[PDB]
Design an enzyme around this catalytic site. Structure first.
Site, PDB file in Angstrom:
ATOM      1  N   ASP A  25      11.362  26.475   4.996  1.00  0.00           N
ATOM      2  CA  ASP A  25      10.603  27.650   5.658  1.00  0.00           C
ATOM      3  C   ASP A  25       9.859  28.509   4.671  1.00  0.00           C
ATOM      4  O   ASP A  25      10.654  29.682   4.191  1.00  0.00           O
ATOM      5  CB  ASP A  25      11.462  28.483   6.244  1.00  0.00           C
ATOM      6  CG  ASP A  25      11.493  29.679   7.161  1.00  0.00           C
ATOM      7  OD1 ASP A  25      10.060  29.667   7.226  1.00  0.00           O
ATOM      8  OD2 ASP A  25      11.974  30.145   7.650  1.00  0.00           O
ATOM      9  N   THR A  26       8.551  28.243   4.632  1.00  0.00           N
ATOM     10  CA  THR A  26       7.789  29.091   3.601  1.00  0.00           C
ATOM     11  C   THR A  26       7.420  30.428   3.839  1.00  0.00           C
ATOM     12  O   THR A  26       7.257  31.409   3.195  1.00  0.00           O
ATOM     13  CB  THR A  26       6.250  28.428   3.331  1.00  0.00           C
ATOM     14  OG1 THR A  26       5.768  28.430   4.465  1.00  0.00           O
ATOM     15  CG2 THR A  26       6.396  26.962   2.766  1.00  0.00           C
ATOM     16  N   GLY A  27       7.834  30.805   5.268  1.00  0.00           N
ATOM     17  CA  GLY A  27       7.438  32.297   5.822  1.00  0.00           C
ATOM     18  C   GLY A  27       9.059  32.878   5.641  1.00  0.00           C
ATOM     19  O   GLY A  27       8.800  34.070   5.725  1.00  0.00           O
TER      20      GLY A  27
END
Ligand SMILES: CC(C)(C)NC(=O)[C@@H]1C[C@@H]2CCCC[C@@H]2CN1C[C@@H](O)[C@H](Cc1ccccc1)NC(=O)[C@H](CC(N)=O)NC(=O)c1ccc2ccccc2n1
Ligand SMILES: [Cl-]
Ligand SMILES: [Cl-]
Ligand code: NA
Lengths: 99, 103
Positions: A25-27
């Protein structure tokens, strides 16, 4: 080791001697795992996302294996509906976003 | 670290987007199924929907086939509008701009 994003980027992790499924999850700033016990000391933390905040337990210096890559970092444990691997550990397996 | 903001994820992967002629900052988010933007006016019809995140659910307005430019890359697709704390570019639009996750 190239991941399309046609589907959710789920991988198998090993944490605390247990296998779980987690979302790359890059967010997410943080790594957040559903309720489980981990060794050592912890402190409470509040973390937020789309809906508001949840209270979690912060465990530092936890070793994790992510899609077979070993890393160490802080892991938050609490009532998340999905296990998420956030940037604090994505950096440790060399993940990059490319477009 | 490495450039946009950035590639290696040492900082938040923030980019500029342009939607309805306005520039906004947004987060490239492989963990998000959908793209969610703060309140703004968009053309056409919408439909309501509840989306869930870490803390719970919020109600948003779904607009389809919206033109949106993401870090210079053109996309045309679904945008959800509502009280998100951060503008989110989710996989529905990351795939249109050809983003990939590599490790
Ligand atoms: C955007 C939407 C379509 C609703 N999808 C999601 O929210 C899904 C929901 C999934 C099920 C619940 C558990 C997490 C996964 C992944 N998320 C995506 C996921 O990437 C989500 C996106 C996001 C970013 C910023 C602010 C809000 C929301 N990140 C997060 O939930 C992480 C959690 C964390 N503390 O690490 N939030 C943050 O990293 C973060 C950063 C800045 C902030 C500013 C103000 C308030 C909150 C802020 N939260
Ligand atoms: Cl860490
Ligand atoms: Cl779409
Ligand atoms: Na510890």
């Amino acid at each position: 080791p190239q991941i399309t994003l046609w589907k959710r980027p789920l991988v198998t992790i090993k944490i605390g001697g247990q296998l779980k499924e987690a979302l790359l999850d890059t967010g997410a700033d943080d790594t957040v795992i559903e309720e489980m016990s981990l060794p050592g000391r912890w402190k409470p933390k509040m973390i937020g996302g789309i809906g508001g905040f949840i209270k979690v337990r912060q465990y530092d210096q936890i070793i994790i294996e992510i899609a077979g890559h070993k890393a160490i970092g802080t892991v938050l444990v609490g009532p998340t509906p999905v296990n998420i691997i956030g940037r604090n550990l994505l950096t440790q397996i060399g993940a990059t976003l490319n477009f």
